[PDB]
Structures are given as C-alpha cells and as structure tokens.
Amino acid sequence: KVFGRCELAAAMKRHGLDNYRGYSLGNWVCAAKFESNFNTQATNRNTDGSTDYGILQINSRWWCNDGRTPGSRNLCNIPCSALLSSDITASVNCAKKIVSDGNGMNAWVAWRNRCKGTDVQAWIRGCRL
C-alpha cells in the first residue's frame, strides 16, 4: 500500500506513535517519507546482507527474521514479511521498540540526515487528526 501523507499521519496516531518517546507525529511521517516514500512494500538490501523492510525500513540485522541475515537477531519477534503489510500495526509496534533502544530516532539514519532539526510539523500540516 502507498499511503498519502495525512492518511499515514492518521494511521500512526491511531496506533499510538504520536509523541511516542517524545517524537511528534511529523517526525514519524518525515521518517516514513524518506525511508519508504510511504510504501508499505518497500525493501532495500544493505551491503552487509541485511534487508530493511516496510514503511519505516526496519532492519533484519536486529529487529525481524528473514532467514537470510547470518548472526542477526529478531528482537521484534516477527517475520520481516509482517513489516510489508497494508496494516501498519507490526511496523508501529516494532518501531516503538527501536525508538526505546537508547538513541531515539537516530536509529533511522534518513531521519537523522533529512528530518532531525527541520520543520517536521509541515508533514502533518492541514491533516484532519
């Protein structure tokens, strides 16, 4: 599924991401825009052989099982395919664990490089939330 900007803001708020770990909804919408372009089916292979999955590009190195990332963990206790669903519940649940792990949203390098410190409220501007 390819979400619209306000459609995703609303789904993230329904699943309790808004202000989770003090990160306003615009931070989450901006991270999703640059990780996946709002596409739940986004996948990207990393040079180390891990793969990033879904709207928030969650990495198989630590967070989900894809069976092809040697020495990896599965700390969200999910198949990485669950992160590609039209329903974002598994991505949001896992994202809550990642953002709790100690470095906040810096875990998402695209958030650090493209969202952090910017006018992230623009991402929810106009949205009926």
Task: Name the site residues for Na ion (rule: CB under 5 A).
Answer: 60, 65, 69, 72, 74
DSSP string, 8-50: HHHHHHHTT-TTBTTB-HHHHHHHHHHHHTTBTT-EEE-TTS-
Which entry of 7, 35, 48, 66 is annotated as an active-site residue? 35
Instruction: Find out whether 79 and 66 touch, Cβ atoms under 8 Å.
Output: yes
Q: Which of residues 27 and 69 has its CB atom nearest to Na ion in the complex? A: 69
**Burial code of 45-76, b = ≥16 C-beta within 10 A, e = fewer?**
eeeeebbbbbbbbbbbbbbbbbeebeebeeeb
Q: Which of residues 70 and 117 has its CB atom nearest to Na ion in the complex? A: 70
Closest separation in Å from C-beta 73 to Cl ion: 4
- 52 as an active site residue: the answer is yes
Closest separation in Å from C-beta 112 to Na ion: 22
66 is in an annotated binding site: no
- 7 as an active site residue: the answer is no
- Considering only residues 29 to 58 of the shown chain, the ones binding Cl ion according to CB under 5 A are none
- Considering only residues 94 to 113 of the shown chain, the ones binding Cl ion according to CB under 5 A are 104
8, amino acid identity:
L
The set of catalytic residues is 35, 52
Annotated binding-site residue numbers for substrate: 101
